Amino acid sequence: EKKRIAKERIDILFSLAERVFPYSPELAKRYVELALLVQQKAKVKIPRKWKRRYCKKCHAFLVPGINARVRLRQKRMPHIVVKCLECGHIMRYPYIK
C-alpha cells in the first residue's frame, strides 16, 4: 500500500518539479528532496535518465541551457559531457545506440 502511494506520489511531484523548475528552480528543488526519499524510502523506480537534469553531486533539478550543460561529440565512441552549474561538477556519459 505504501509502494502504491509512492507510485502516484512520485509521479506527481515529479511532474510538478519539472514544470515548476522551469517556472520555479527552488520548488522543483524542494520536491526533488521530497521525490528523493519517495524513491528510496518508498522503494520505487530507480533514476536513470533524470541524470540529464538531476545532480548526484548536490541533488537538484538542472535543465540544459538554463542551469545545466550537456555536450556530445563523436569520433571513436561518442561521449556526452554533463555538469552541474549549481555545484560545478564535471561528469561524463558515453553514448550507446
Binding site: 500500500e1 502516484e8 506520489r9 506527481i12 514544470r19 520548488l27 519517495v38
Partner: protein
C-alpha cells in the same frame, strides 16, 4: 527574494501535474505539492479560514497558493483540509505529516 512571490498563481503547473489519487490514507502519505486544501483552524490572525493550493512541504513548513498570495502555515500550526480526488473532503491535522513527509512514505520510524 523568495520563489513563493514568483510561483504564486501558476496553480496551472500544479494542475496539469497534480492528479495523484488523493485520499487521507494518501494525503499524509502523498507529496504535498499541488493538492488543494484550506486553512480552517490555525494560530495566525492572517491564515485562519483561508483556502490555497499546496506548494511547499518541509521539516518546518507547509505552503498553499491562491490568487496573488501564499498560504504560509506550518504543519503543526494548523489543520489542513485537502479535498479527495473523489470529490471527498479530507479532514487531517497538519500535525500528522508534521515536518516529515518521509515518515509516511517510509512508514513510522524504522526500529
Amino acid at each position: 527574494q523568495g520563489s513563493y512571490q514568483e510561483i504564486i498563481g501558476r496553480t496551472w503547473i500544479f494542475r496539469g501535474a497534480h492528479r495523484g489519487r488523493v485520499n487521507k490514507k494518501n494525503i499524509v502519505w502523498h507529496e504535498l505539492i499541488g493538492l488543494k486544501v484550506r486553512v480552517v483552524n490555525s494560530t495566525h490572525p492572517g491564515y485562519v479560514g483561508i483556502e490555497g493550493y499546496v506548494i511547499d512541504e518541509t521539516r518546518n513548513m507547509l505552503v498553499i497558493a491562491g490568487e496573488n498570495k501564499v498560504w504560509k502555515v506550518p504543519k503543526d500550526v494548523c489543520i489542513f483540509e485537502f479535498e479527495t480526488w473523489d470529490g471527498t473532503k479530507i479532514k487531517i491535522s497538519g500535525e500528522k505529516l508534521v515536518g516529515r513527509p518521509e515518515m509516511r512514505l517510509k512508514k513510522r520510524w524504522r526500529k
